[PDB]
Design a protein around this nucleic acid. Structure first.
Lengths: 71, 102, 144, 67, 214, 135, 148
RNA sequence: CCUCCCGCUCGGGAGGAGGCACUCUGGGGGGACUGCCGGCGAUAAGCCGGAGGAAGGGGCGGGCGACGGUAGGUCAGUAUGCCCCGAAACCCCCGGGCUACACGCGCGCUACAAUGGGCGGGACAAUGGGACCCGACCUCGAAAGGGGAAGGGAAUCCCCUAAACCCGCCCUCAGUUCGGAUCGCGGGCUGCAACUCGCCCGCGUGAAGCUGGAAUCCCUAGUACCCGCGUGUCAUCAUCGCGCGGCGAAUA
């Protein structure tokens, strides 16, 4: 394929969980791609994802989020 | 002399070992050469049973154990040196078989 | 420098089954493939190989075992029969291909009945084999 | 699912560090030799636990706060 | 039978299934590198127990993962050499044992046409058969959304291999496509991203329906 | 020469192995390694023997007797024991640590083997219930 | 080869295909798959080749092993019906003899007034037990013998 | 050391002496306890992560189910209050019925083929059960089975062969060489006796079914999925119930 732009983002911290099916786990990510670099985004990451995993972002303009919380 | 086999089984663990140990201790010192008390298998008996008398819903099912253990003893002594050693009290409930050959 | 132990059973069986055509003492009797066959066959095959394999096994099995019986070699083959929708079960072969076979070997001098009640190899059944395996184990190193 | 040591196990290791505190150590097996001789051995598995807690109760007594 | 023994001299040295060197390929993407057991060695059957831990299933030999998602379909009924089956399916109503043969013959049938190390055609078919984006009908806060959810490298692999293994059994259905073949003609065309892979038709649609909804 | 007797046990295929010096003997239940029909579980046995080398395989006689039900079961009991037969032989931590980094099925068995079939509520298999449809 | 045909006629005018000799006779009612390979032996042909590779001379060797099989060999449990209606020793069955012999014995019972003949008329297995709800959802066994 | 076979004379295999090493058997003992190390937490409890290790943080699988309730289930196992029967709602007998079917559903087996079928060969288990009982082995019979007969009241003998496996060969995707219903016949076996109403073996016969709507069930690892194996009760009806080992995951 043509690339799109692969906007690699490595996750920095795993804030908690979202989805009613539970399915999304919201993870905060830091970017390592040739255009932006460094940007802090709070993306909806599914499936098993550890700390320090890599996630190819499809669109760079996103950040969907709903937050709270442990007591 | 006459090589005798004491074949001794019991339904429970505590009863069989005390007799096997005592038989190897009293026989040791007299006119007896004795080969050691060898353990053969537990023919563990499984009875596998339906609890509930309705046979209804879920019925939880009892597993049963009857474990019968067999020690065996060869001995070289007389028929008179045999009864002297068969004096012992013996648990209820302990079968002692005697084959006699030369 | 070989036994029946050293040769794979896929290469041993067409080398002994040929050596049962060639010698040429053991042969197919006509009644045994016709319809006196073992349990049910999807088709009945018109083969010499068919007779020569049911016997080429029999000289390997009596080697391993001592008192190897008729009821053992009937039950040793592997194969079933339908009951219906009830699932299949384990049955034994035709005793006709096993009780004439041991007796075609017995006249050949390859097998003999022992006096303890059973079936064992002779030296002539034991040497017929070690020569056929010395030829097979030698060929298995030549061939990459 | 979840782990928590029973209260019989803690009642017992607590008073066993109370009577003879100085005949206990920060080795597992030694305390385990001592616990054997003081209170009953109803079995082997519990006899490792009480001993497991007593060792932690000597680590905390050094700190200054022991509960 | 003699080639078979050459296939026993050759895996020894070291190579998968008798004659495929595990060095021929490399994982060029640093995403699918820790998630794949291309690098380790010899046999899939292994019985190394997985799902034991958090990611006790990432270290699974790529082919073993293939074998048991290729083994999947299976109830009740009874198999033996007798008259006797089906019971082991269009996908092993039964074992990884007669499964491992299918994948071996499919490595044989994909090597016969392409002529490459087939472990370079399959690892090229499990980086393309995985969709890069998925929509979950996810509601959070009582509010029903159908949302942008990006896919994790572990849950990628799984959708790659499973969609490869789901496509073949629609085609093998009472058809000359043997799974040793129907898989070998799925693995070439999922490697290529061809318009004939029921496994690269869902990959796309799952990203494309998921782009609309975002 | 020497006699170092070891064991190798996986899912109740118990392999009885012996490693003495000689000329490249591979005996399994009396028959050479050649008699087996699956190519596959052979290669499994063969894994350790190359990780160390053919040098030590050729110089040493290995007889094993694997009394175990599985075809792959036999092989697996053969994979664990050769590897342990070769680590006792040379003695070094080089051949032991080289096995552990590759796989732990060379030098650890299992902690578990099999579970009983539970009594259950009148059906077939340990973990299953009768089908319901009374709602 | 022995002279290719796609349709040779065997067992009268009924047709022999191009499937395999052992499967082409199975169809001809009376000769099955085990009885086809019993008449390949006596006659002297290769069993696994295609059907239709037969000169005229092979087609005559089969038609006389059929008329009387108990003359050529064929054991007295390996022939089609042994001990017939209490006074025939052995016979042959073919599409006309099998159709007649089985309807005859059924014509016999209905007059006898048995629990076998009227149990073949109402719509039932006799010894297979359940008529309780099997042949379920309007369905039917088709009893004897052919819905193709 | 000794008997047998083979040999390229290097060397492979069996038997018996011999030897208890090994597997194993069953009785006892140690080992795992958040002990230690880091992080989160009130420095407490606890959760997470790490090392060493055969095994780890309820290690893992069972038994173990409070006070009670649904007037749940059983007086048709027994025990038992009350009522009822008294040539009978007793008692004995043969025969028939429970196995009747236009149909409806529940729980299951078998199944719609090339990951296949035949044929042959080879490498593999475990729980168990075995005296009018398991039956070596030898013989006759196509076989089911029959005749003879060793051992065995049991780690020492028998059922017994595992099945899945793999390798070569024949076969070449059709309602078929699938699938086995239904029907004719020949034949065994138990009991007084298997038509109603047994199972198997052989030949002939050869049905529906070519992946299933609405709807809905089961389970989370040596598990499911899969393959055979035994036992109970027991002559004989097992596609059942209980239990064993072989292959060996998905997702959480």
């Amino acid at each position: 394929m043509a690339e799109d732009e692969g906007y690699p983002a490595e996750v920095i911290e795993i804030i908690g969980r979202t989805g009613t099916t539970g399915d999304v786990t919201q993870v905060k990510v830091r970017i390592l791609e040739g255009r932006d670099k460094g940007r802090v985004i709070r993306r909806n990451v599914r499936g098993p994802v550890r700390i320090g995993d890599i996630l190819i972002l499809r669109e760079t303009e996103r950040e969907a989020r709903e937050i709270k919380s442990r007591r | 002399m006459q090589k005798a086999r004491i074949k001794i089984a019991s339904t429970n663990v505590r009863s069989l070992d005390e007799v096997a140990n005592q038989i190897k201790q009293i026989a040791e010192r007299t006119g007896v050469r004795m080969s050691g008390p060898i353990p053969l298998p537990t023919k563990r008996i499984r009875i596998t049973t339906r609890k509930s008398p309705d046979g209804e819903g879920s019925a939880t099912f009892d597993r049963w154990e009857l474990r019968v253990h067999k020690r065996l003893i060869d001995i070289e002594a007389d028929e008179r040196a045999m009864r002297q050693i068969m004096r012992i009290r013996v648990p209820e409930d302990v079968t002692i078989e005697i084959e006699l050959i030369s | 420098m070989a036994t029946v132990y050293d040769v794979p059973g896929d290469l041993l069986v067409e080398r002994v089954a040929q050596r049962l055509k060639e010698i040429p003492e053991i042969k197919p009797p006509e009644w045994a493939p016709f319809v006196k066959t073992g349990r049910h066959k999807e088709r009945l095959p018109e083969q010499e190989d068919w007779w020569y394999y049911r016997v080429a096994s029999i000289l390997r099995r009596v080697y391993l075992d001592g008192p190897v019986g008729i009821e053992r070699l009937r039950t040793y083959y592997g194969g079933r029969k339908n009951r219906g929708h009830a699932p299949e079960k384990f049955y034994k072969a035709g005793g006709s291909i096993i009780r004439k076979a041991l007796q075609q070997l017995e006249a050949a001098g390859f097998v003999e009945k022992v006096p303890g009640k059973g079936r064992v190899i002779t030296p002539k059944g034991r040497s017929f084999l070690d020569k056929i395996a010395t030829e097979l184990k030698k060929e298995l190193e030549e061939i990459i | 699912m979840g782990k928590i040591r029973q209260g019989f196990i803690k009642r017992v290791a607590r008073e066993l560090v109370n009577k003879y505190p100085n005949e206990f150590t920060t080795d597992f097996e030694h305390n385990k030799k001592k616990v054997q001789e003081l209170t009953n051995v109803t079995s082997k598995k519990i006899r490792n636990r009480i001993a497991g807690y007593v060792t932690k109760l000597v680590r905390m007594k050094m700190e200054g706060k022991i509960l | 039978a003699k080639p078979l023994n050459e296939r026993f001299f050759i895996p020894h040295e070291i190579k998968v299934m008798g004659r495929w060197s595990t060095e021929d390929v490399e994982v060029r993407d640093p995403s699918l590198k820790p998630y794949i057991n291309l690098e380790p060695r010899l046999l899939p059957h292994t019985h190394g127990r997985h799902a034991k831990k958090h990611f006790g299933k990432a270290n699974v030999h790529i082919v073993e993962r293939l074998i048991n998602k290729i083994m999947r379909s299976g109830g009740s009924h009874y198999k033996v050499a007798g008259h006797f089956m089906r019971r082991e399916h269009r996908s092993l109503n039964s074992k990884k044992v007669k499964a491992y043969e299918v994948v071996k013959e499919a490595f044989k049938i994909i090597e016969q046409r392409t002529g490459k190390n087939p472990i370079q055609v399959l690892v090229w078919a499990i980086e393309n058969a995985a969709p890069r984006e998925d929509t979950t009908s996810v509601m959070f806060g009582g509010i029903r959304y159908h949302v942008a959810v990006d896919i994790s490298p572990m849950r990628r692999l799984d959708v790659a291999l499973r969609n490869i293994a789901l496509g073949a059994s629609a085609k093998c259905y009472r058809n000359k496509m043997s799974f040793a073949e129907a898989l070998a003609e799925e693995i070439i065309l999922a490697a290529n991203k061809d318009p004939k892979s029921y496994a690269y038709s869902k990959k796309l649609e799952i990203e494309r329906i998921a782009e609309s909804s975002r | 020469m020497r006699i170092i007797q070891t064991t190798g046990k996986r899912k109740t295929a118990i392999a009885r192995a012996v490693i003495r010096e000689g000329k490249g003997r591979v005996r399994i239940n009396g028959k050479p390694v050649e008699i087996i029909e699956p190519e596959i579980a052979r290669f499994t046995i063969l894994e350790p023997l190359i990780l160390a080398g053919e040098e030590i395989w050729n110089s040493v006689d290995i007889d094993v007797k694997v009394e175990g039900g599985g075809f792959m079961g036999q092989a697996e009991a053969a994979r664990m024991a050769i590897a342990r037969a070769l680590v006792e032989w040379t003695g070094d931590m080089s051949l032991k640590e080289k096995f552990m980094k590759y796989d732990r099925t060379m030098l650890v068995g299992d902690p578990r083997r099999t579970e009983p079939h539970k009594p259950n509520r009148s059906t077939k298999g340990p973990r299953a219930k009768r089908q319901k449809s009374y709602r | 080869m022995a002279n290719f045909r796609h349709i040779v006629r065997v067992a009268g005018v009924d047709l022999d295909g191009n499937k395999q000799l052992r499967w082409a006779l199975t169809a001809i009612k009376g000769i099955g798959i085990n009885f086809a390979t019993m008449v390949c032996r006596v006659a002297g042909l290769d069993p696994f080749m295609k059907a239709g590779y037969l000169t005229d001379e092979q087609v005559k060797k089969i038609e006389e092993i059929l008329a009387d099989p108990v003359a050529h060999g064929i054991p007295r449990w390996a022939v089609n019906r042994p001990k017939d209606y209490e006074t025939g020793r052995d016979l042959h069955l073919i599409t006309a003899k099998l159709d007649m012999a089985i309807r005859e014995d059924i014509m016999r019972l209905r007059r006898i007034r048995a629990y076998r003949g009227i149990r073949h008329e109402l719509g039932l297995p006799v010894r297979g037990q359940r008529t309780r709800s099997n042949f379920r959802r309007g369905q039917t066994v088709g009893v004897s013998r052919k819905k193709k």
